[PDB]
């Protein structure tokens, strides 16, 4: 499986992940997490749904910590790319595992939610996630392990 294929899968996984996380957590949420195009029957759509379900407990455990941190980081449309890239790079500095790959999806979700709540961005954050994983060689790491479906089979 190619890195470009993983990148295309990543967009679908993240799109579906944010839909199901939004629904799981029902604060103003971003309507585009509902209304942007979505194929719930697709293969990667189902992977993203499963990742959201799996992560519900851990996400609730750390919700207050992340939101206090994001509240003080104050990400905006102007600096979100810089902050996302620095966070994502440092996250993988000591190594890649599926937990950390999935945690980056969760950070993307929280980042998109925060910028919506405080400004007037989901499409952009989607590109940040896909492009980072592609160019930083996370996509290769995923391809070596059989693709995104491997995340459901630890």
């Amino acid at each position: 499986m190619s890195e470009e294929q993983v990148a295309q899968d990543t967009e679908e996984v993240f799109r579906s992940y944010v839909f199901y996380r939004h629904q799981q957590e029902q604060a103003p949420a971003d309507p585009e997490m509902v209304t942007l195009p979505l194929q719930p029957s697709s293969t990667m759509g189902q992977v993203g749904r499963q990742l959201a379900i799996i992560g519900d407990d851990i996400n609730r455990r750390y919700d207050s910590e992340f939101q206090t941190m994001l509240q003080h980081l104050q990400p905006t449309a102007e600096n979100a790319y810089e902050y996302f890239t620095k966070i994502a790079t440092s996250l993988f500095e000591s190594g890649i595992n599926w937990g950390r790959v999935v945690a980056l999806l969760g950070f993307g979700y929280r980042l998109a939610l925060h910028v919506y709540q405080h400004g007037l961005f989901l499409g952009q954050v989607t590109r940040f996630v896909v492009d980072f994983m592609l160019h930083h060689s996370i996509a290769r790491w995923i391809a070596q392990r059989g693709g995104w479906v491997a995340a459901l089979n630890l």
Binding site: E65, M69, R100, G106
Partner: peptide, 23 residues
Amino acid sequence: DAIIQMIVELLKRVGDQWEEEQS
């Protein structure tokens, strides 16, 4: 940069806890 590294530390902790529980 301080809060960047604070977020990174939490994501690493969240991710490693996720990995172990799913494994």
